[PDB]
Structure 1
Amino acid sequence: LIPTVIRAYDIYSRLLKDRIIMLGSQIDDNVANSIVSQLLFLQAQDSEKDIYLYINSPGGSVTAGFAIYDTIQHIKPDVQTICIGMAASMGSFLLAAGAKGKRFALPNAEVMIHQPLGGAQGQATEIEIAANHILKTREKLNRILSERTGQSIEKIQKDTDRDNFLTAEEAKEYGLIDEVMVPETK
């Protein structure tokens, strides 16, 4: 049950009013379509002011993740990315896809990078097509990470061969984020 805040907003709709979008679950097409539409709407409201993408996600669909990636790059406003809780797989990809100098993580947040997961069954030719497709998809993802992080493509491939868990501070020095957002007031 999502609480209401007083016009009357559900808490997530209230956050959208101050240009905060919530990527808070597994990335499927429904989540992507919603985050795309929110990005488009916020552009139309104001092309100058920053948008804030909250990321607490284990990842999910690559294609759905790319719907969000492209929409972030297409629109005029800077899209800040803030990892809170965890950003894994396509979650961590989108965290690195934020506007330069405005990608953050909170101190105890967990960033994880790995290679894409998929499947194929049937004839040897069908297996070959699926294998060729997912290998092209991985290289596409590794290319963009290399550009976004400033690590070489070969380093990205080695480090994503298996699940690679990084602390907030480790994700900064890797180049996935720009800053560990510390508690100033405390």
Structure 2
Amino acid sequence: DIYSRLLKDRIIMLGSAIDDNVANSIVSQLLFLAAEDPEKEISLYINSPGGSITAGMAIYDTMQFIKPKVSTICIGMAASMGAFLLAAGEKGKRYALPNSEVMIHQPEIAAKRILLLRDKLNKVLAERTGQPLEVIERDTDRDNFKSAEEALEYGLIDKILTH
């Protein structure tokens, strides 16, 4: 019911791990909200431990494709593909709460596609964050946690919500 109220307000809640069911859910909601008003914003709230790289790449592609801008907001934690979806939000509308945390660490389908998707993830990260590619390469390979401050400085968010 709270999810329904949020959706009437063009709000999507990604509060669980990302597998194919969550991917289809978020994708359907994105497409629906864009069908209702192609030029009104969507806000994607992220409290996700991360998950499947293919599912997350699906969500990311849909975010790009729809005409609305998708602002992203980190509530509790954005890890793995959740951190990537956060960093892939609308220019200027990437937010985190003060005590939020962001680890861009990232752990039946052919291995080759996994490698190639991982490389697109890497380069998209580099362009949206400004870091040299090789740096994004290293940091998405090691366990490492940042905070709203350190993330913002890294360029994974655009603003912290204070006061």
When normalised by structure 1's length, the TM-score is: 0.83
User: Pick from 96, 103, 124: which aligns with 2:87?
Assistant: 96
Correspondence list, 1:21-40, <5 A: 21-40=12-31
After superposition, give the CA deviation of every residue in 1:40-85 in whole Å (9 maximum; x if it has no partner).
1111111121100000001001110011101000011110000000
Task: Please provide the CA RMSD for this pair.
Answer: 1.6
The answer to whether structure 1 residue 154 and structure 2 residue 145 are counterparts is no
Deviations 1:16-46 (A, max 9, x none): 0000000000000110101111111111111
The alpha-carbon deviation at position 102 of structure 1 amounts to 0.2
Question: Residue 135 in 1 paired to residue 93 in 2?
Answer: no
C-alpha distance in structure 1 between counterparts of 2:134 and 2:62, whole Å:
27
Show the counterpart of 1:79.
70
**SS at 2:157 equivalent:** coil
Structure with bigger gyration radius: 1
Q: Name the % identity.
A: 75
1:58 aligned partner, one-letter code: P
Q: CA deviation at 1:136?
A: 2.8
C-alpha separation in 1, matches of 2:149 and 2:20: 31
Find runs of 4+ consecutive structure 1 residues off by over 2 angstroms: 132-138
Higher RCO (C-alpha under 8 Å, 6+ residues apart): 2
Counterparts of 1:43-62 in structure 2 under 5 Å? 43-62=34-53
Structure 1 residues 112-171: Cα deviation after superposition (integer angstroms, max 9, x where no partner): 0113x3x99xxxxxxxx73x5443332221111001111111011122221110001111
Paired residue total: 163
Q: 1:12 matched to which residue of 2? A: 3
Q: 1-side partners of 2:99 and 2:114: how far apart? A: 32
- More strand as a share of residues: 1
Aligned residue number for residue 145 of structure 2: 165
State the AA in 1 paired with 2:146.
Answer: L
